[PDB]
Design a protein around this nucleic acid. Structure first.
Ligand SMILES: [Zn+2]
Ligand SMILES: [Zn+2]
Ligand SMILES: [Zn+2]
Length: 89
DNA sequence: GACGCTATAAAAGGAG
DNA sequence: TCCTTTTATAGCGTCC
């Protein structure tokens, strides 16, 4: 069994290797958000959801682009940006 | 075009 | 293992 943990929701039925990931996933169904932003008090489903958000307050931009050295708050925004240097408008 | 941001999935770290 | 963190992937929505 590579992914022994299955989602209880008949409709969804997503599979996971670690039980942690299954519990975290189930939260999207129940709508429970255990991670709270201490500035605006908003709630998030994940550790990363909260971390991505704290940066909107702090203005921290950890991710730099290799080509132009421009900074971004999140990983995806940075990765997606780099692709523009490989094409025209 | 570009990118700020939220969501969510996949994986890894660390301690008992 | 269980719990904490980290990395990856998808879109949305809006301004340019
Ligand atoms: Zn599910
Ligand atoms: Zn906040
Ligand atoms: Zn760049």
């Amino acid at each position: 069994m590579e992914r022994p943990y299955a989602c209880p929701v008949e409709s969804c039925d997503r599979r996971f290797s670690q039980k942690t990931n299954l519990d975290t996933h189930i939260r999207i169904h129940t709508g429970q958000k255990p991670f709270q932003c201490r500035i605006c008090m908003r709630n998030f489903s994940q550790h990363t959801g909260l971390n991505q958000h704290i940066r909107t307050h702090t203005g921290e931009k950890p991710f730099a682009c290799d080509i132009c050295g421009r900074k971004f708050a999140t990983l995806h925004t940075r990765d997606r940006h780099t692709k523009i240097h490989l094409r025209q408008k």
